[PDB]
Amino acid sequence: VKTPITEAIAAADTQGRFLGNTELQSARGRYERAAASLEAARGLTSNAQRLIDGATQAVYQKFPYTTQTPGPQFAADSRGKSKCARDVGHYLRIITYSLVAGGTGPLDEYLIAGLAEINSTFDLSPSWYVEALKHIKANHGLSGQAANEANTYIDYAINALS
Amino acid sequence: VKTPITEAIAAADTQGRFLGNTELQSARGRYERAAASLEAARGLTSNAQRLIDGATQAVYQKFPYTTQTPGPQFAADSRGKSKCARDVGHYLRIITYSLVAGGTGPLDEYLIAGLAEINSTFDLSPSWYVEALKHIKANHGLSGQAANEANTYIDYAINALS
Amino acid sequence: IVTKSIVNADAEARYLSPGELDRIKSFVAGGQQRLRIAQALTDNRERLVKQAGDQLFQKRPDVVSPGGNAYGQEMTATCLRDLDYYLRLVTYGIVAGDVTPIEEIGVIGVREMYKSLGTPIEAVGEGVRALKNAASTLLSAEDAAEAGSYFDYVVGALQ
Amino acid sequence: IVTKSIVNADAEARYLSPGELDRIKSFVAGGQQRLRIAQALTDNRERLVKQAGDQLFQKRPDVVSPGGNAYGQEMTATCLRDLDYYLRLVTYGIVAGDVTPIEEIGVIGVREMYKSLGTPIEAVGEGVRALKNAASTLLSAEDAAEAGSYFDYVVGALQ
Amino acid sequence: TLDVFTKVVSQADSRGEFLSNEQLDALANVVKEGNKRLDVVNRITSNASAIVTNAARALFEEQPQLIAPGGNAYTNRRMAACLRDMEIILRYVTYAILAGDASVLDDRCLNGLRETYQALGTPGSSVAVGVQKMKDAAVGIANDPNGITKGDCSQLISEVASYFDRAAAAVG
Amino acid sequence: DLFRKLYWTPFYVCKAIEYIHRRLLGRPTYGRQENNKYFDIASKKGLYA
Amino acid sequence: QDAITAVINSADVQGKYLDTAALEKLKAYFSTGELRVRAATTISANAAAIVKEAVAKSLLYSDITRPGGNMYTTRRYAACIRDLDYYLRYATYAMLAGDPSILDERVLNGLKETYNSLGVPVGATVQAIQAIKEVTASLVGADAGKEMGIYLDYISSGLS
Amino acid sequence: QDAITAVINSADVQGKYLDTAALEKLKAYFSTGELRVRAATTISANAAAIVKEAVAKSLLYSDITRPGGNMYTTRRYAACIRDLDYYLRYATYAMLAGDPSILDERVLNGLKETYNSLGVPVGATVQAIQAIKEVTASLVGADAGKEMGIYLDYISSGLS
Amino acid sequence: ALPLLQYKPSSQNHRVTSFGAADQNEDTPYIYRIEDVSSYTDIQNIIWASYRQVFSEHEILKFNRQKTLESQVKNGSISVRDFIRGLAKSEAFYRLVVSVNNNYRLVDITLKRLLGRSSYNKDEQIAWSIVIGTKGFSGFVDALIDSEEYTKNFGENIVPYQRKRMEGRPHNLVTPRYGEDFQEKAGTVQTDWRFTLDKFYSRKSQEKQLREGDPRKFADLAASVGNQGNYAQRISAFDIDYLNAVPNR
Numbered sequence A, B: 001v002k003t004p005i006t007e008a009i010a011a012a013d014t015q016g017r018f019l020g021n022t023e024l025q026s027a028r029g030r031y032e033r034a035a036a037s038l039e040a041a042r043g044l045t046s047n048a049q050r051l052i053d054g055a056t057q058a059v060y061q062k063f064p065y066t067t068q069t070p071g072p073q074f075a076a077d078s079r080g081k082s083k084c085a086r087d088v089g090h091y092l093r094i095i096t097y098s099l100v101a102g103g104t105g106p107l108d109e110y111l112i113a114g115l116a117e118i119n120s121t122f123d124l125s126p127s128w129y130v131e132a133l134k135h136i137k138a139n140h141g142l143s144g145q146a147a148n149e150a151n152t153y154i155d156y157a158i159n160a161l162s
Numbered sequence C, D: 001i002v003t004k005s006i007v008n009a010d011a012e013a014r015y016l017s018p019g020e021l022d023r024i025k026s027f028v029a030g031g032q033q034r035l036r037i038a039q040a041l042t043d044n045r046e047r048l049v050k051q052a053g054d055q056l057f058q059k060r061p062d063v064v065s066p067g068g069n070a071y072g073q074e075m076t077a078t079c080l081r082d083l084d085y086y087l088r089l090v091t092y093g094i095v096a097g098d099v100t101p102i103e104e105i106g107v108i109g110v111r112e113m114y115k116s117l118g119t120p121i122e123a124v125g126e127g128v129r130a131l132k133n134a135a136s137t138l139l140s141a142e143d144a145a146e147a148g149s150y151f152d153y154v155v156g157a158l159q
Numbered sequence E: 001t002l003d004v005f006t007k008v009v010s011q012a013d014s015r016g017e018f019l020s021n022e023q024l025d026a027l028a029n030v031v032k033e034g035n036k037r038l039d040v041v042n043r044i045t046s047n048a049s050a051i052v053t054n055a056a057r058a059l060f061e062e063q064p065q066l067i068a069p070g071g072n073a074y075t076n077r078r079m080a081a082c083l084r085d086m087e088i089i090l091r092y093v094t095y096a097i098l099a100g101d102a103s104v105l106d107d108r109c110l111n112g113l114r115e116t117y118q119a120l121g122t123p124g125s126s127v128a129v130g131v132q133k134m135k136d137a138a139v140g141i142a143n144d145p146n147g148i149t150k151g152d153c154s155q156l157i158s159e160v161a162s163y164f165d166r167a168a169a170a171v172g
Numbered sequence F: 001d002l003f004r005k006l007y008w009t010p011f012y013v014c015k016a017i018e019y020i021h022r023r024l025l026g027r028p029t030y031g032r033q034e035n036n037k038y039f040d041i042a043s044k045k046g047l048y049a
Numbered sequence G, H: 001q002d003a004i005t006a007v008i009n010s011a012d013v014q015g016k017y018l019d020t021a022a023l024e025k026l027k028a029y030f031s032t033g034e035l036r037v038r039a040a041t042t043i044s045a046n047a048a049a050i051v052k053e054a055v056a057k058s059l060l061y062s063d064i065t066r067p068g069g070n071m072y073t074t075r076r077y078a079a080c081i082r083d084l085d086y087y088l089r090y091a092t093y094a095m096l097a098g099d100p101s102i103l104d105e106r107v108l109n110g111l112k113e114t115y116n117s118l119g120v121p122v123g124a125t126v127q128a129i130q131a132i133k134e135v136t137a138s139l140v141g142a143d144a145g146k147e148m149g150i151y152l153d154y155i156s157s158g159l160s
Numbered sequence I: 001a002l003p004l005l006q007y008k009p010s011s012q013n014h015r016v017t018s019f020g021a022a023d024q025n026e027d028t029p030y031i032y033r034i035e036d037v038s039s040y041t042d043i044q045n046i047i048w049a050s051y052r053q054v055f056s057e058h059e060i061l062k063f064n065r066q067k068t069l070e071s072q073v074k075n076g077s078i079s080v081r082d083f084i085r086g087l088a089k090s091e092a093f094y095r096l097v098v099s100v101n102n103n104y105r106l107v108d109i110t111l112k113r114l115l116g117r118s119s120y121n122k123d124e125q126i127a128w129s130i131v132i133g134t135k136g137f138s139g140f141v142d143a144l145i146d147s148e149e150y151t152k153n154f155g156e157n158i159v160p161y162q163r164k165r166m167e168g169r170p171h172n173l174v175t176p177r178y179g180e181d182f183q184e185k186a187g188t189v190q191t192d193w194r195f196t197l198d199k200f201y202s203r204k205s206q207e208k209q210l211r212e213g214d215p216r217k218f219a220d221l222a223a224s225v226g227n228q229g230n231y232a233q234r235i236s237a238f239d240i241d242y243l244n245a246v247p248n249r
């Protein structure tokens, strides 16, 4: 699965050669950023419960019909609101997973793989989840270069949504 | 040709996706070693003429028969010694080329590609060139982390020789 | 080795003489090499039992032969379990620095046990010799010397 | 340490242990430093004995009091000769590694002797403690730990 | 292909919780020791071809029937066959030290190795006598300090040698 | 060494003195008149005395 | 028993090999053995001075050495010095072993039986062992005096 | 007893007034009482979690909870939890008093007698108290975890 | 570098002629050809059925699809044989099959998907498993599509398909993308409780459940040791001639 340490391996393995300085150089780059990436993981893990209920009530604001229309897909029923905090709470897990991995791999393999297939069948509009993630990237309270770090992977999930 | 900036491209191009943060991690990492790699290029370029004639007379020491045996391949007369400083002087060019590129690409494409084919036909024993490169890696006078930097690519040419 | 000096000075009414304190300080210094040797013999146990069974059943085929004791899979598994026990006691003696906690568990009554089990003791001694040879191949020179020390004690004890 | 190891393996029916052979190897390895310590103590015989005896008479003025034993030039010369003898036995024990030369030359029957001579034991012991302090100040630091621990055996065995 | 970074994700996904702070303090030590890890890796690959023949000066000298007529390393293609994959041990052990976890090595290098080595007829146990001779030369190069800043990479040395011991266990 | 590691090392000093009287002399000690006598002897030279 | 022998026994009765926690215990023992040996040497230096200072601190000029007390007769004074020398010597052995099992096996086995049989006062013995502990913790330093006081307080707690 | 009561007693048995060293001891106790009280509060918070984590660290999935072990029967598991809760609670009392005398008076008095009578394994108890000490030193911090580990190691040393 | 060791080929269906064109059944696959364009429905079917062989239908998804190689196929710039190389040497296929499977099983899974035949014996899987190791995976996929069994049977411009499976299970169905030895590592048999019931009474759990001790723990070690002893001597005891058997001095 996609990781800068893995991407050095799978590039050098398909050539059948050893680890050159060009695969080794790539690993060195990852460490400088991995020091600031783990700063972004603790910023989201400690503020996790504020961010989930901060998000799942922000999507109810912009889409008030989602709590009103009687449908299996809709979150108007309590059972939907129980599956609301499950789904949005699944997003902050994988965002924090792809932070400490350094790559988009866990985001690519757990979350966005086959997302167009599932949202068409269950009629979950992807405009809902992109509205929650814009709330997360503006309200995590992170600062410095770590604020850039979470902001890529959130925005990477945004582009894969649309 | 093989470069950490190129290796980020050819990995992301064969997937048909954009540049993720995993391809973009390497570029940040590469600059930090590229700052110490260009230190190693000036250390070899300024001491270039001392290192070539330092090497081509060191190989004559360990192999004294190479100046004595009459053969087109051997360096008996002046024409071999003219082609001596050409060949060993070709090595310090490509070593300095692969220093500033950051990868083994120019070393992989100019020097070692098809080297087993040419040394069998012209009967040039590869034990000669590995003896010159051991003289270079011990007598370049480089220090610090830059001394590590030239020492990989010299030793990478050694392993491809044997 | 501390219990040895303590009961040694304890039979006497004198304290621990400071030459004994010097030997305890030197053992305390060498304890790190002892721990590395014991961990190296620890993690590679099944290789040592495999090569010991190899060299033993190549050396003495009568345990393989049906008149011998180690005939069949169950009896040969009990045989390699005995060799595993002796390797474990050798690691204990390597850590303790003196052969008391290995003789107390494996030596002090072994002849009558193996006599009333039917097995010959010389084959067990050859098995510990094979363990010593395999650990000599596994370790460095100064480590194989110090392991072959306690392996040598077991080989002398089983005879 | 060879004599003690041999008689200890003599009390048992078995040979010398691998542990004990490690002890002999470490004693051989430290033997050259012990010869250096013996070199320093041999060459500092005079001033060590005089400083220790005068430290004793500073601590204990009862011996050089006219009711005491070491009253007079000849008696105090024999006092300093006794301290010389004990420093010589300490050098022997530092070289040998055992305390059996210290013991069977100067420890084993000294209480009954100094009882019959009228000499107090504790002042001998305080003088050997002064020797320990003086030789500790002369030598290198953990080298002085080595010398002072044999001195410590002599001090604890005299009392 | 797993990592130290990705395996502490993968079990953390299976329990479905956020990553704890003492796991991040664990990974912070992994980043901290990363520079040391890189140095060890470059010395192995630069002496990669020098290890294999120096192991082949003893892999064949100790069991000399193997290259003598009859052994499975006898003819010349057969001899080049146990240099074409003596190095593949080094090709994947160096991948394991780079990733920091032996999961990459297990999937390709040793998954089917013990099955072919009785299908071909080669002695399987005669490999792991010389992979140990590689480990004796690999940790001798990785520990020696030549033109390098003084540092302590002892932990890597023991679990560098653990990858060779896993490489010898599944062949023998 | 076997007699020491069987009847002097695992037991109390007075218990070991009494048991050594049961073995060697073949009778229990009468009173205390023998008891911190052999225990006073044990305090200067040890088991061997 | 040792600390080494206790670690080996605890690993043995499970059939367990030497795992990393046991290796941590043995390496901690091999770290502390330096000051263990140095403390045992300087306690073997002047044991008589320690016992003398302890009886001068705690037991002397009381009613215990007066007639009617248990230390009045001179053989009882000599027995008192013998018991205190025993406590100090076996505490030295337990300090160098790093395991208090020899105190349980050789000293604390039938000692309350003896001290209640003879009419020996127990509280004065506890205070004498306390004075022993203070004197040797002053003499050896705090860092080894802690480990000396652990086994001397073990003797004091088992005695009570 | 307290540290205050021990200082007052040591000044009393001499007939001595409160000199400056005793006032130093009392003022050091009055300085350390802040973190003493805060540590006692957060240990009283989650004692059951500490005992659960300690048995999950040390005693669980061994042979002790298997049949044949001493914690196989469910009344014996409940007695094990009771004994560990006792060790933690009395270590909290000794930490807040600043004097280990209540451990000697209420816990360590006849405990080896009981544990050798019932056949309770002593080394597993020592390792369980060690796991208790590690868990509460992690939970309370290092600065109060030192004083908690002092009395827990006191219980462990007196038990052995 | 080194040439292929010679391996024995087992007799399978496709080594046989199967004469004629007008005679085979309906169930031979549609032999979709880029030369037949005539519409976009044929163009989209050629792309979709070329994904069918490579990703076994379920995966095609949206993300896995490389849109630029399909962008190219409509144009005709790259042949279908070149187009399968783009799908096979793609890291969306590497994470899906290549990392997950083994070098011995990868030879079996890529011959069914790129050449449309199962491997004959295990010796064929043994033979190519070396060519994977030194050249890399894309070096081996290059060697499969350059191979003359590919170009003779499929050609440059025909999507692959199972050749002659008259009475056989379909290859995307009989073979998953990972087998049973790898199943714990990619799958979730560890966390599903349905499988741990099967595991509980499994003979492998009884070897785990036993305490330290018993020779049944060393029973697997006892089979690997070998070295069985020689039988007793045939020669009769009576002749022995024991009186003259003793040697003096």
Ligand SMILES: CCC1=C(C)/C(=C/C2=NC(=C\c3[nH]c(/C=C4\NC(=O)[C@H](C)[C@H]4CC)c(C)c3CCC(=O)O)/C(CCC(=O)O)=C2C)NC1=O
Binding pocket: A056, A059, A066, A072, A073, A074, A075, A076, A079, A080, A081, A083, A084, A085, A086, A087, A088, A090, A091, A110, A111, A118, A122, A124, A128
């Ligand atoms: C681990 C990563 C992961 C996520 C996040 C995920 C989400 C996910 N949410 C689903 C349904 C759902 N998702 C929601 C959530 C919402 N609908 C609303 O009305 C709200 C606007 C919104 C929450 C804020 C609801 C209510 C359902 C049930 C809809 C249905 O049953 O038709 C479904 C299809 C059915 C299912 O198994 O439950 C998936 C696959 N799956 C994954 O594997």
Ligand SMILES: CCC1=C(C)/C(=C/C2=NC(=C\c3[nH]c(/C=C4\NC(=O)[C@H](C)[C@H]4CC)c(C)c3CCC(=O)O)/C(CCC(=O)O)=C2C)NC1=O
Binding pocket: B056, B059, B066, B072, B073, B074, B075, B076, B079, B080, B081, B083, B084, B085, B086, B087, B088, B090, B091, B110, B111, B118, B122, B124, B128
């Ligand atoms: C740009 C990188 C580069 C290098 C370095 C290179 C070397 C190279 N040296 C060659 C021959 C040669 N190389 C040498 C050099 C030597 N022989 C000796 O006796 C000495 C020991 C040694 C010099 C120190 C000589 C004398 C020849 C001519 C041999 C012949 O003609 O048979 C040849 C074959 C014929 C040729 O075109 O001249 C090549 C390709 N080619 C490359 O493209």
Ligand SMILES: CCC1=C(C)/C(=C/C2=NC(=C\c3[nH]c(/C=C4\NC(=O)[C@H](C)[C@H]4CC)c(C)c3CCC(=O)O)/C(CCC(=O)O)=C2C)NC1=O
Binding pocket: C056, C063, C068, C069, C070, C071, C075, C076, C078, C079, C080, C082, C083, C085, C086, C089, C105, C106, C110, C117, C118, C119, C120, C121, C123, C124, C127
């Ligand atoms: C750690 C201390 C320790 C020792 C020494 C020990 C020995 C020991 N060896 C046994 C059996 C055995 N031991 C052997 C031994 C051998 N195979 C041979 O041919 C050789 C002579 C030798 C080993 C190479 C055999 C064959 C048996 C099974 C004999 C039987 O079933 O009667 C048994 C009885 C079965 C058992 O409960 O394991 C014990 C107790 N047990 C211990 O706990």
Ligand SMILES: CCC1=C(C)/C(=C/C2=NC(=C\c3[nH]c(/C=C4\NC(=O)[C@H](C)[C@H]4CC)c(C)c3CCC(=O)O)/C(CCC(=O)O)=C2C)NC1=O
Binding pocket: D063, D069, D070, D071, D075, D076, D078, D079, D080, D082, D083, D085, D086, D105, D106, D117, D119, D120, D121, D122, D123, D124, D125, D127
């Ligand atoms: C190698 C072992 C060894 C020892 C120890 C030893 C002692 C020794 N000390 C003696 C006298 C003496 N020893 C002392 C000793 C002392 N003055 C004090 O108050 C101090 C406590 C002490 C100094 C350490 C005195 C004052 C005399 C003279 C007593 C007399 O002449 O009656 C004598 C009798 C005269 C002589 O022959 O010198 C001997 C033999 N001899 C030995 O062979």
Ligand SMILES: CCC1=C(C)/C(=C/C2=NC(=C\c3[nH]c(/C=C4\NC(=O)[C@H](C)[C@H]4CC)c(C)c3CCC(=O)O)/C(CCC(=O)O)=C2C)NC1=O
Binding pocket: E059, E066, E071, E072, E073, E074, E077, E078, E079, E080, E081, E082, E083, E085, E086, E088, E108, E109, E110, E113, E116, E120, E122, E123, E126, E127, I005, I103, I126, I127, I128, I129, I130, I131, I133
């Ligand atoms: C990537 C992991 C990987 C490994 C390691 C691997 C090994 C491997 N070694 C082989 C043969 C061989 N293996 C050896 C190696 C040896 N024989 C000896 O005599 C020596 C004792 C020993 C080397 C130390 C030789 C000489 C051959 C050729 C044998 C033959 O052609 O029959 C073969 C069968 C033919 C082949 O393609 O070359 C495989 C599959 N394959 C893999 O995919």
Ligand SMILES: CCC1=C(C)/C(=C/C2=NC(=C\c3[nH]c(/C=C4\NC(=O)[C@H](C)[C@H]4CC)c(C)c3CCC(=O)O)/C(CCC(=O)O)=C2C)NC1=O
Binding pocket: A024, A025, A027, A028, B033, B145, B148, E035, E036, E038, E039, E040, E042, E142, E143, E144, E145, E148, E149, E150, E151, E152, E153, E154, E156
């Ligand atoms: C991928 C290309 C690359 C390499 C190769 C690399 C290596 C590398 N190793 C370093 C440090 C170091 N490397 C070592 C390694 C060791 N010391 C020993 O004595 C041990 C035997 C051995 C480990 C087994 C040590 C001890 C340091 C000290 C500095 C530090 O902790 O990083 C540093 C710190 C920065 C510097 O040296 O300028 C670099 C650059 N950095 C890179 O970007």
Ligand SMILES: CCC1=C(C)/C(=C/C2=NC(=C\c3[nH]c(/C=C4\NC(=O)[C@H](C)[C@H]4CC)c(C)c3CCC(=O)O)/C(CCC(=O)O)=C2C)NC1=O
Binding pocket: F012, F013, F014, F035, F036, F037, F039, F040, G064, G070, G071, G075, G076, G077, G079, G080, G081, G083, G084, G086, G087, G090, G106, G107, G108, G111, G114, G118, G120, G121, G122, G124, G125, G128
């Ligand atoms: C190694 C462990 C060990 C101990 C401690 C031990 C003690 C011990 N103390 C004894 C007597 C004694 N013990 C004491 C000691 C004391 N009475 C006091 O008032 C003080 C509080 C305390 C001294 C600090 C006295 C005064 C006697 C004399 C009773 C008598 O013999 O009449 C006796 C009776 C016989 C004899 O001394 O020789 C024994 C056996 N034996 C042992 O094996």
Ligand SMILES: CCC1=C(C)/C(=C/C2=NC(=C\c3[nH]c(/C=C4\NC(=O)[C@H](C)[C@H]4CC)c(C)c3CCC(=O)O)/C(CCC(=O)O)=C2C)NC1=O
Binding pocket: H064, H070, H071, H075, H076, H077, H079, H080, H081, H083, H084, H086, H087, H090, H106, H107, H108, H111, H114, H118, H120, H121, H122, H124, H125, H128
């Ligand atoms: C305040 C100080 C104090 C303690 C400690 C104490 C302990 C104590 N533990 C007991 C039993 C027990 N104690 C244990 C404890 C253990 N066994 C093990 O295997 C473990 C190593 C250890 C737990 C960590 C067990 C299992 C029993 C049950 C024996 C039985 O009742 O059958 C009993 C017998 C009666 C009863 O529990 O109700 C007492 C009195 N009493 C006290 O007043």
Ligand SMILES: CCC1=C(C)/C(=C/C2=NC(=C\c3[nH]c(/C=C4\NC(=O)[C@H](C)[C@H]4CC)c(C)c3CCC(=O)O)/C(CCC(=O)O)=C2C)NC1=O
Binding pocket: I010, I011, I012, I013, I014, I015, I016, I017, I018, I164, I166
């Ligand atoms: C080179 C080695 C080799 C062989 C031998 C081989 C045989 C082979 N025989 C087949 C069928 C068949 N084979 C027979 C054969 C027979 N019917 C009879 O009554 C006779 C007893 C017998 C012939 C003497 C029949 C009737 C079929 C068709 C069966 C069916 O379609 O149901 C098929 C399936 C269709 C096809 O021909 O492609 C194969 C692959 N393949 C090989 O690669």
